[PDB]
């Protein structure tokens, strides 16, 4: 009985492969051969803030491009002004093992999560004037990897037990569960339209999910190792992926195959974090060799390089208008570059 | 303006508080527990005093923070770097699993020990090996032979000889004999001197680190 199912799956997978291969008349490398290159790109530091004392693992910009939140293993979240290098709030934590942080679009809430398997939500604007814990969402059997806000009363998260979740905040109950992966889910990024979201897993696969309905729409393959970070194009019809085998890839949701890859014979170390920039001309990535790189989205030729840290770059961020970057690394320092 | 100066002053105050907190917290010793299923993983943690479980205890003006991560059931490689700077790893091995099978449990424990010891993140990290259950080991030896687990082993039926052989074969797998040291101690269900053994081990590690870091050698 099961042999019939296995052979049907094999035949239908072969059919899918043939269908994708029969619609591959052109490639981006051949088409984008007469365009003018950007040239050499150089970037320099602009501010340096030194409040932390241990490895920084997360950082997320605010909506106004002025306030930011940073998370490190010392057991504290810090709120910073990127303009005057002051600190607003110092939030203690119950668990020191954290791996993600987020900022609400309205600016009223922050979120945290890690190896303690619980997503914690804090509210900033309160009448007393001190930050107080609000909600503690639990129900995951893995470990949290990323979490982003959609609005004031909804949030999505991804766990290491091959699942993702969407839940509302007033009642601490799961609303929708997304399943289908085989390995640990590593990163997710929400769409500008706030209707779909992409995710990357440990089995070299990327999936697209519908928020309202709740089943996987598309799957993408191509890498030979773990997927470590994901981002979203501003247009909303592309995304960029980084992996542990020293390469990046760019995908398209209306074509359903891989388009182009960034790699070099020199680079051996893996890629930890990725972030996209405005207009879709610059792609910024953090690597294991203590450096950050800037690439063109139109060709694999390398554009610019950045080196100002003494340890592994862990997190990368860009403001809404793509005018500067923030880099947090393992040397307990995070910097601003413009 | 005045507002910028007031914000600066609040920032400086919070910075002072953060530095004081970090100075306070940068003195406690951290330990990582590892094991294989039913072993001294639970008896030891009971004798010292969801995901990560933390145990805190004080011993002769040293604060010990012990992390148990056994209930993870995920990919170990992805979160193993978070424990990079830990002082030591307590590895628990079942001594009376030579007959039970679930592929022998002893082989699985040996494989886990080999994988953990030669990890890239734990290069200068010390490992404390705990042979967990021995009170009923004497009866199991006097009633059943040890040849089933080890066909090559040859020796008398004395518990001393078999224990020494097990200890030697488990310390054999250590690739590096100069960067790290492995310490071995036999524990019983009613033993109450394991805390002192761990204290001696950690103070030796601390004095060695202090000597090596800046001074001689």
């Amino acid at each position, epitope marked *: 009985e099961l042999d019939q199912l296995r052979q049907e799956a094999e035949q239908l997978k072969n059919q899918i492969r043939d269908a994708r291969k029969a619609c591959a008349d052109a490639t981006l490398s051949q088409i984008t051969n007469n365009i003018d290159p950007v040239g050499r790109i150089q970037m320099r530091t602009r501010r340096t803030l030194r409040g932390h004392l241990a490895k920084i693992y997360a950082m997320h910009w605010g909506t106004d491009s002025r306030l930011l939140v940073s998370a490190s293993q010392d057991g504290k979240l810090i709120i910073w002004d990127s303009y005057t290098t002051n600190k607003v709030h110092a939030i203690p934590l119950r668990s020191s093992w954290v791996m993600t942080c987020a900022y609400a679009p309205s600016g009223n809430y922050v979120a945290c999560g890690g190896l303690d398997n619980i997503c914690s939500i804090y509210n900033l*604007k309160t*009448r*007393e*004037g*001190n930050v107080r814990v609000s909600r503690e969402l639990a129900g995951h059997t893995g470990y949290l990897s990323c979490c982003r806000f959609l609005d004031d009363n909804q949030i999505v998260t991804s766990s290491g037990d091959t699942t993702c979740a969407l839940w509302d905040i007033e009642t601490g109950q799961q609303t929708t569960t997304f399943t289908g992966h085989t390995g640990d889910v590593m990163s997710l990024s929400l769409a500008p339209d706030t209707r779909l979201f992409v995710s990357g897993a440990c089995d070299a696969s990327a999936k697209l999910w519908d928020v309202r309905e709740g089943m996987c729409r598309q799957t993408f393959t191509g890498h030979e190792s773990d997927i470590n970070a994901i981002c979203f194009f501003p247009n909303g019809n592309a995304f960029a992926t980084g992996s542990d085998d020293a390469t990046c890839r760019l995908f398209d949701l209306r074509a359903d195959q891989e388009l182009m890859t960034y790699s070099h014979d020199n680079i051996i170390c893996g890629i930890t974090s990725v972030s996209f920039s405005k207009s879709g001309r610059l792609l910024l990535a953090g690597y294991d060799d203590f450096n950050c790189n800037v690439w063109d989205a139109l060709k694999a030729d390398r554009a610019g390089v950045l080196a100002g840290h003494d340890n592994r770059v862990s997190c990368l961020g860009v403001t809404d208008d793509g005018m500067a970057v923030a880099t947090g690394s393992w040397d307990s320092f995070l910097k601003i570059w413009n | *303006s*005045a507002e910028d100066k007031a*914000a600066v*002053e609040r920032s400086k105050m919070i910075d002072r508080n953060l530095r004081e907190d970090g100075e306070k917290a940068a003195r406690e010793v951290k330990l990582l527990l590892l094991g294989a299923g039913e072993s001294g993983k639970n008896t030891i943690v009971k004798q010292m005093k969801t995901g990560i479980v933390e145990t805190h205890f004080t011993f002769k003006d040293l604060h010990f923070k012990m992390f148990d991560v056994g209930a993870q059931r995920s990919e170990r490689k992805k979160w193993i770097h978070c424990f990079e700077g830990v002082t030591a790893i307590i590895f628990c091995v079942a001594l009376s699993d030579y007959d039970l099978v679930l592929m022998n449990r002893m082989h699985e424990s040996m494989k886990l020990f080999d994988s953990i010891c030669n990890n890239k993140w734990f290069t200068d990290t010390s490992i404390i090996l705990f042979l967990n259950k021995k009170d009923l080991f004497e009866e199991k030896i006097k009633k059943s032979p040890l040849t089933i687990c080890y066909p090559e082993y040859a020796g008398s039926n004395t518990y001393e000889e078999a224990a020494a052989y097990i200890q030697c074969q488990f310390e054999d797998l250590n690739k590096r004999k100069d960067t790290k040291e492995i310490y071995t101690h036999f524990t019983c269900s009613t033993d109450t001197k394991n805390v002192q053994f761990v204290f001696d081990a950690v103070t030796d590690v601390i004095i060695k680190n202090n000597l090596k870091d800046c001074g001689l050698f």
Partner: single-chain antibody, 233 residues
Framework: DVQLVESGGGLVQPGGSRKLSCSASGFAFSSFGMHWVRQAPEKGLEWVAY????????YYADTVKGRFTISRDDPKNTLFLQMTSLRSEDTAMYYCVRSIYYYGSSPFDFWGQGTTLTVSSDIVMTQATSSVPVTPGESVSISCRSS???????????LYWFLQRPGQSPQLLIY???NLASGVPDRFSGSGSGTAFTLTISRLEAEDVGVYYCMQHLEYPLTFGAGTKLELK
């Protein structure tokens, strides 16, 4: 929730000394700096003193520079004010205002009850208007003039609008230009520019009776205006 009470004040002979106290309960007193405001029995508002969080910067005025003492204690959540000499001009009622300072902070958000005491260069704002007859259902405008420009190189101004209903402590409406307060309907809007600013109210109501006050936060010497009464016949 937030509650601040003040005690101390009465009949005192000239030349004496007096101590006033202010207490709070349940608003994280250790993270709030305080200011003192003195209002004359006739009209007008003045600035007395300022204490910072952590007993840091302490500021006074020109008249009360060498005679006033301001101090606080974070434990028990208390502040004290010590008067060394009392003159004929020291008859007024005083109010204690809380404030916190960061990017999105709203200084001068809460006021106490105030205490009445009887004894028995610097920028100038004019606010020439004194009273404008009004009726419910229409829109009104109140203008205010300033001596020097309040537009800092930061890109923002420092303009405070306050409303004092008769029999009530002042509340906050517009702590900074084109920025509303909390607990206030959206019918208020400053929308000022240059040096002379304005305040527009689209619709009136029975609770819109009181006096309006303008305040500048560029130089720490603080001066208020004269007020603009709305009789609302």
């Amino acid at each position: 929730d937030v509650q601040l009470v003040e005690s101390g004040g009465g009949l005192v002979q000239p030349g004496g000394s007096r101590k006033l106290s202010c207490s709070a309960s349940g608003f994280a007193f250790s993270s709030f700096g305080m200011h003192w405001v003195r209002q004359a029995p006739e009209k007008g508002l003045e600035w007395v003193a300022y204490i910072s969080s952590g007993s840091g910067t302490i500021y006074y005025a020109d008249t009360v520079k060498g005679r006033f003492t301001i101090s606080r204690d974070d434990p028990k959540n208390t502040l004290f004010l010590q008067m060394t000499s009392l003159r004929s001009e020291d008859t007024a009622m005083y109010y204690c205002v809380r404030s916190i300072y960061y990017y999105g902070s709203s200084p001068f958000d809460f006021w106490g009850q105030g205490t009445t005491l009887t004894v028995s260069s610097d920028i100038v704002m004019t606010q020439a208007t004194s009273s404008v007859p009004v009726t419910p259902g229409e829109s009104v405008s109140i203008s205010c003039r300033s001596s020097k420009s309040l537009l800092h190189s930061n890109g923002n101004t420092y303009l405070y609008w306050f409303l004092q209903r008769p029999g009530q402590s002042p509340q906050l409406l517009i702590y900074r230009m084109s920025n509303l307060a909390s607990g206030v309907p959206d019918r208020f809007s400053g929308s000022g520019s240059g040096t002379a600013f304005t305040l527009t109210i689209s619709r009136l109501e029975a609770e819109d009776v009181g006096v309006y006050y303008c305040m500048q936060h560029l130089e720490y010497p603080l001066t208020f205006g004269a007020g603009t009464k709305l009789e609302l016949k």
